């Protein structure tokens, strides 16, 4: 269950607005984001990942190597500098983003053709589920 390769289509998205509000994204743009169809495209080779989230108005890409800290500028989101680090905790892929916000990061659970994603910031957790296309 350590294979996240694929195109992933959203099945559920809970507390999306609370998570976006914790990150301080504009109320008006949060309203638009909650209606957009989001597609997750992941390419994974060894320790190297390319992750792409696509919608009609907002796009987000990140590339990283498991175990190698990297500087991340969330130019597409809340426009903050964080020190990001992605690791394996068993079969869970864990990202911690050190910076202004506490408890910032995300976890992914690849159970066959289903991907569970939890985005955290502060006291907010957004839970998403995707199915491999
Ligand atoms: C490993 C998965 C990480 C991941 C999955 C889905 C999204 C993100 C990161 C964000 C934080 C980049 C993000 C932002 C949005 N917005 C509304 C469209 C604001 C740009 C949606 C989905 C994801």
Short mmCIF file of C-alpha atoms and ligand atoms in Angstrom, two decimals:
data_model
loop_
_atom_site.label_atom_id
_atom_site.label_comp_id
_atom_site.label_asym_id
_atom_site.label_seq_id
_atom_site.Cartn_x
_atom_site.Cartn_y
_atom_site.Cartn_z
CA UNK A 1 0.00 0.00 0.00
CA UNK A 2 2.98 2.28 -0.62
CA UNK A 3 2.05 2.96 -4.24
CA UNK A 4 0.34 6.31 -4.83
CA UNK A 5 0.89 6.45 -8.60
CA UNK A 6 -2.12 7.53 -10.59
CA UNK A 7 -4.94 9.92 -11.37
CA UNK A 8 -7.22 10.24 -8.34
CA UNK A 9 -10.80 11.53 -8.43
CA UNK A 10 -12.50 13.00 -5.39
CA UNK A 11 -15.22 11.06 -3.60
CA UNK A 12 -15.56 13.05 -0.37
CA UNK A 13 -14.23 16.23 1.21
CA UNK A 14 -15.09 17.08 4.83
CA UNK A 15 -14.23 20.31 6.72
CA UNK A 16 -12.62 21.80 3.62
CA UNK A 17 -13.77 25.31 4.50
CA UNK A 18 -12.57 25.10 8.11
CA UNK A 19 -9.12 23.95 6.97
CA UNK A 20 -8.92 26.76 4.38
CA UNK A 21 -10.01 29.27 7.01
CA UNK A 22 -7.29 28.04 9.40
CA UNK A 23 -4.76 28.81 6.65
CA UNK A 24 -6.31 32.32 6.24
CA UNK A 25 -7.49 32.01 2.63
CA UNK A 26 -9.97 34.74 1.64
CA UNK A 27 -13.64 34.06 2.48
CA UNK A 28 -14.74 34.93 -1.06
CA UNK A 29 -12.16 32.60 -2.68
CA UNK A 30 -12.98 29.85 -0.22
CA UNK A 31 -16.55 29.99 -1.46
CA UNK A 32 -15.33 29.36 -5.00
CA UNK A 33 -12.89 26.64 -4.02
CA UNK A 34 -15.60 24.59 -2.29
CA UNK A 35 -17.48 24.16 -5.58
CA UNK A 36 -14.55 23.17 -7.83
CA UNK A 37 -13.85 19.62 -8.93
CA UNK A 38 -10.39 18.65 -7.70
CA UNK A 39 -8.21 16.01 -9.37
CA UNK A 40 -5.03 14.61 -7.77
CA UNK A 41 -2.28 13.36 -10.10
CA UNK A 42 0.70 11.63 -8.48
CA UNK A 43 3.86 10.34 -10.11
CA UNK A 44 6.07 8.27 -7.82
CA UNK A 45 9.48 6.78 -8.63
CA UNK A 46 11.66 5.50 -5.82
CA UNK A 47 11.79 8.26 -3.23
CA UNK A 48 10.81 10.91 -5.81
CA UNK A 49 7.27 12.29 -5.98
CA UNK A 50 5.52 14.77 -8.27
CA UNK A 51 2.09 15.74 -6.91
CA UNK A 52 -0.39 17.85 -8.89
CA UNK A 53 -3.82 19.04 -7.72
CA UNK A 54 -5.85 20.55 -10.54
CA UNK A 55 -9.13 22.46 -10.78
CA UNK A 56 -10.46 25.13 -13.10
CA UNK A 57 -9.38 28.08 -10.98
CA UNK A 58 -6.76 26.77 -8.57
CA UNK A 59 -3.77 24.54 -9.36
CA UNK A 60 -1.07 23.24 -6.97
CA UNK A 61 2.10 21.29 -7.74
CA UNK A 62 4.85 20.03 -5.45
CA UNK A 63 7.87 17.84 -6.11
CA UNK A 64 9.86 16.24 -3.32
CA UNK A 65 12.13 13.41 -2.25
CA UNK A 66 11.13 11.33 0.77
CA UNK A 67 13.42 12.15 3.66
CA UNK A 68 14.88 15.39 2.24
CA UNK A 69 13.73 18.66 3.79
CA UNK A 70 12.78 21.29 1.24
CA UNK A 71 11.78 24.93 1.26
CA UNK A 72 8.18 25.37 0.18
CA UNK A 73 6.48 28.62 -0.77
CA UNK A 74 2.74 28.06 -0.90
CA UNK A 75 2.37 30.74 -3.59
CA UNK A 76 -0.90 29.18 -4.83
CA UNK A 77 -2.48 28.98 -1.35
CA UNK A 78 -1.74 31.12 1.71
CA UNK A 79 1.62 32.39 0.34
CA UNK A 80 3.80 31.31 3.27
CA UNK A 81 7.33 29.93 3.54
CA UNK A 82 7.53 26.54 5.27
CA UNK A 83 10.20 23.89 5.77
CA UNK A 84 8.55 20.76 4.38
CA UNK A 85 9.53 17.15 4.97
CA UNK A 86 7.83 13.96 3.72
CA UNK A 87 8.52 10.60 5.39
CA UNK A 88 7.11 7.09 5.66
CA UNK A 89 5.60 6.15 9.02
CA UNK A 90 4.98 2.51 8.23
CA UNK A 91 2.75 2.63 5.17
CA UNK A 92 1.52 6.18 5.94
CA UNK A 93 3.06 9.03 3.92
CA UNK A 94 3.46 11.98 6.32
CA UNK A 95 4.28 15.58 5.49
CA UNK A 96 5.18 18.14 8.16
CA UNK A 97 5.40 21.79 7.12
CA UNK A 98 7.29 23.73 9.78
CA UNK A 99 6.55 27.44 9.96
CA UNK A 100 4.10 29.93 11.37
CA UNK A 101 1.12 27.57 11.66
CA UNK A 102 1.09 24.78 14.23
CA UNK A 103 0.23 21.21 13.25
CA UNK A 104 0.66 21.95 9.52
CA UNK A 105 1.03 19.01 7.06
CA UNK A 106 -0.95 16.12 5.48
CA UNK A 107 -1.18 12.27 5.60
CA UNK A 108 -2.17 9.86 2.81
CA UNK A 109 -3.60 6.33 3.18
CA UNK A 110 -3.36 4.29 -0.09
CA UNK A 111 -5.68 1.25 0.46
CA UNK A 112 -5.70 -0.45 -2.99
CA UNK A 113 -7.55 1.92 -5.38
CA UNK A 114 -8.64 4.32 -2.57
CA UNK A 115 -6.60 7.27 -1.19
CA UNK A 116 -7.43 8.88 2.20
CA UNK A 117 -5.90 12.33 2.68
CA UNK A 118 -5.93 14.39 5.87
CA UNK A 119 -4.86 18.03 5.61
CA UNK A 120 -4.13 19.71 8.93
CA UNK A 121 -3.49 23.25 10.11
CA UNK A 122 -3.89 24.49 13.64
CA UNK A 123 -6.87 22.74 15.23
CA UNK A 124 -8.51 21.95 11.87
CA UNK A 125 -8.46 18.70 9.90
CA UNK A 126 -9.88 18.29 6.40
CA UNK A 127 -10.53 14.70 5.37
CA UNK A 128 -10.63 13.78 1.69
CA UNK A 129 -11.11 10.46 -0.08
CA UNK A 130 -10.14 9.74 -3.70
CA UNK A 131 -10.60 6.77 -6.02
CA UNK A 132 -8.00 5.80 -8.62
CA UNK A 133 -9.29 6.45 -12.14
C1 LIG B 1 -0.35 14.70 -0.68
C2 LIG B 1 -1.55 15.63 -0.91
C3 LIG B 1 -1.44 16.92 -0.68
C4 LIG B 1 -2.57 17.86 -1.08
C5 LIG B 1 -3.90 17.29 -1.62
C6 LIG B 1 -5.03 18.24 -2.02
C7 LIG B 1 -4.84 19.76 -1.89
C8 LIG B 1 -3.54 20.32 -1.36
C9 LIG B 1 -2.39 19.38 -0.95
C10 LIG B 1 -3.66 21.85 -1.34
C11 LIG B 1 -3.49 22.36 0.09
C12 LIG B 1 -2.59 22.46 -2.24
C13 LIG B 1 -5.05 22.22 -1.87
C14 LIG B 1 -5.73 23.59 -2.08
C15 LIG B 1 -7.16 23.64 -2.63
N1 LIG B 1 -7.82 24.93 -2.84
C16 LIG B 1 -9.18 24.97 -3.34
C17 LIG B 1 -9.20 24.44 -4.77
C18 LIG B 1 -7.11 26.16 -2.53
C19 LIG B 1 -6.06 26.41 -3.61
C20 LIG B 1 -7.91 22.34 -2.98
C21 LIG B 1 -7.21 20.99 -2.76
C22 LIG B 1 -5.78 20.94 -2.20
#
